[PDB]
Amino acid sequence: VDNKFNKELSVAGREIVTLPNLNDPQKKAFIFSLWDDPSQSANLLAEAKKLNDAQAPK
Amino acid sequence: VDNKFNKEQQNAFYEILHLPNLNEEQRNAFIQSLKDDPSQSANLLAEAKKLNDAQAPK
DSSP states (O other): OOSOOHHHIIIIIHHHHHOTTOOHHHHHHHHHHHHHOGGGHHHHHHHHHHHHHHHSOO | OOSHHHHHHHHHHHHHHHOTTOOHHHHHHHHHHHHHOSTTHHHHHHHHHHHHHHHSOO
């Protein structure tokens, strides 16, 4: 259930915006899905770092 | 009823997070005013962009 998780987008969104191995198009669709459903914002931030590993080693 | 505010909150959210001079206080507060108020989302990105240049180093 979502309860206005705006604080979660500040931490999840900004980390998904500039994690060390992600590219601009993936974070774009990532934040746009994070904005639509911030209930998965914790999982989105993790998905951002997990995806960064596929392009470059952590 | 229109599809502009649907992704304007998404683009404004993303830009608030991707602005080079927005911090957690400015970017997260924007996500609070943006997630709760859809009509002010473009203005939120404009004020976040406005903060990006004002807060930016000179």
